[PDB]
Amino acid sequence: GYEPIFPVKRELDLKKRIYQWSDGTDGYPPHLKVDGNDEANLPADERQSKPGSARSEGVGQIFDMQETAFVSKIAQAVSFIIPKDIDHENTPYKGPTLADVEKFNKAQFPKKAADIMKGRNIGEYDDWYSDARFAQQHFSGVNPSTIETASQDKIKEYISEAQKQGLDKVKAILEDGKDILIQDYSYFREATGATNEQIFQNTVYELKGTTPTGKTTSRYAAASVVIFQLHEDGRLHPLAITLDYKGSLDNSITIFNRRLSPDDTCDIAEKEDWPWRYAKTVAQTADWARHEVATHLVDTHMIEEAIIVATNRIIPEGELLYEILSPHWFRTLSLNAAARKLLVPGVIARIAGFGPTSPSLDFKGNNAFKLIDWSYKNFNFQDKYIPNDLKKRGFDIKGDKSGKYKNYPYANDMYLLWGIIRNFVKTVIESQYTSDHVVQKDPYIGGWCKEIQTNGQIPTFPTITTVEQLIDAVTMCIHTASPQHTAVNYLQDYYYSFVPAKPPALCTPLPQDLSALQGYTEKDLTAALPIGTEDMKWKDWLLAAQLPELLSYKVQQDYNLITYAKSLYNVNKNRTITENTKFNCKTIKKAAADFYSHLKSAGVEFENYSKGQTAGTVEYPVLQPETTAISILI
């Protein structure tokens, strides 16, 4: 005789040993436990191998050999006097003026530059500073998913502050209030637990090895609020920027646009309106933060890693849920390990203006980690289902025929792309989940929900009772891993390579009051940017510029959403679902024929939604299925 072997119980026991949760002492939300976040402490198959290797060896190479070496060289360089290696007679930060920097930038456009825009950045447009091209980023930039209808209380607040400054023209627009949109970063204070008297400051220290020399520099951030009007023709126009929101507008400092329609022209040109150009640069730091922390890192990288852990712990390999979800995980785990190790500490905490210091010792007391922590807690899995997302933020893509969202290619593209995926999920899911009863009698789904709700710390994940709830939930997992991440990741090089367009943080403190702001000149906007060889600003530009170069490297064809729709070949797991005779392989091949046929179709509609934008608007080519990654693999 022997010991009785339970195949499933044995498998899920070995998984709960390999895929353990982190305990939260490292300062991050719940993730895969990896001692010191080292490569060799990962599951054998989830760690990087040489390129061109058998999938068994590993996941190949996540980042560019040479690009990683550079970013590390930079983040390690901790003396304020730039190394001899990096030093050049001509660099993109040297300046000293904006003009000099803009001139260098355009010389560096080719003809690597191996992103989807091929080395072009928003600097190609001579009016990158403009209200049109600023405001458009909230719809077609790197963070197009946060913009929202203003509450009646935020409108009534700006009516009060406008009538206090004595601008009856703006008061009228807001008091009527047709299509008043908001971009609210005021939550940054409550997320870090900073009071309204306190101000965001990252004191960077100069080091010789480990020993600090007493010399420091400072980067500053702001809890900015931006109020827009969306016009009937589809153009988004910014009306007012609050620099740093502190409880009420009375206590904050709020500049209004001198141009109240996008067609307006004033005696002070946009290019020469330094008070407004500054106010825009401040809010471009607030969006940089919300993007790299909330929208990019939390709401895709870390939420998906929780799904990967919970699913590996609860649902056995060869189960249908495992075979539809697992393709969308390739490289994600080893990627996030490198992020917790190198990118968030060395780079994000360094170049952001939350602080309190760089370097740090305890990251638990570091406001960038308090923000990551807060964004993860305040994520809502069901409210970020595209149909729910759009309805909640006040965008009726479905029902509007006025061409008012013509310049919102994200919302147009996703509303379609969501349905295409959900259509593929429904057809495969209903292949075995024939009623609410089969879901309720399922061994793993109730425990899978509970695992993610509790251990994963995503209480907003549904208690799956019905086939509709299961389908939306599997969809949200694939949406998050593939298109939603592709959207917010693959345009980074374009909107960040030209730092002054969207800088990580300010290099000078905010003005004392509105009077001081109103007297701002070019010298004040140039001082606030990482321009010059002084104050270790070389480091701030090089990181701001090379981190996007590192992350924006264009997905190889094999790791595409459309190559999977074609073959259903799971790169991650090195098997194909329709070679598993257990499942209805005739239905799944049909679901994939339709999926692949829907993605070819969708590519033409995405192209058309980009071309349908207001003349001269920047293209939105990011959700092209050929350019959409199967998974969060960079």
CB of 631 to Fe ion, least distance (A): 10
Is 306 strand, coil or helix?
Answer: helix
CB of 300 to Fe ion, least distance (A): 7
Residue nearest to Fe ion (CB): 489
* CA triple 128-129-134, angle to 5 deg: 80
CA distance 332 to 311: 14
231 is in an annotated binding site: no
CB of 93 to Fe ion, least distance (A): 25
Q: What is the CA radius of gyration of the chain?
A: 25
CB of 12 to Fe ion, least distance (A): 30
CB of 147 to Fe ion, least distance (A): 21
Helix axes 131-140, 274-290, angle to 10 degrees: 10
Helix axes 537-551, 65-76, angle to 10 degrees: 150
Three-state SS sequence of 460-493: CCCCCCCHHHHHHHHHHHHHHHCHHHHHHHCCHH
CB of 630 to Fe ion, least distance (A): 13
Residue among 224 and 489 whose Cβ is closer to Fe ion: 489
Q: Are strands 575-576 and 254-256 parallel, antiparallel or unpaired?
A: unpaired
Residue among 489 and 572 whose Cβ is closer to Fe ion: 489
Residue among 64 and 522 whose Cβ is closer to Fe ion: 64
CA distance 277 to 504: 16
Is 6 strand, coil or helix?
Answer: coil
Residue among 183 and 631 whose Cβ is closer to Fe ion: 631
Cβ atoms of residues 43 and 333 within 8 Å: yes
31 is in an annotated binding site: no
- The Cα diameter of the chain in Å comes to 94
Residue among 385 and 553 whose Cβ is closer to Fe ion: 553
CB of 89 to Fe ion, least distance (A): 34
Cβ atoms of residues 239 and 229 within 8 Å: yes
Residue among 145 and 489 whose Cβ is closer to Fe ion: 489
What DSSP string describes 126-186? TTTTSHHHHHHHHHHSS--S--EEPPHHHHHHHHHHHHHHT-HHHHHHHHH-SSEEEEE-T
Q: Is 549 exposed, middle or buried (0-12, 13-18, 19+ CB in 10 A)?
A: buried
Cβ atoms of residues 180 and 149 within 8 Å: yes
Residue among 242 and 489 whose Cβ is closer to Fe ion: 489
634 is in an annotated binding site: yes
Residue among 452 and 488 whose Cβ is closer to Fe ion: 488
CA distance 208 to 206: 7
Rounded to 5 degrees, what are φ and ψ at 529?
-105, 155
296 is in an annotated binding site: yes
CB of 546 to Fe ion, least distance (A): 15
What residue ranges bind Fe ion (CB under 5 A)? Answer: 489
Which residue ranges are tagged as binding site? 296, 301, 485, 489, 634
Which residue ranges are tagged as binding site for Fe(2+)? 296, 301, 485, 489, 634
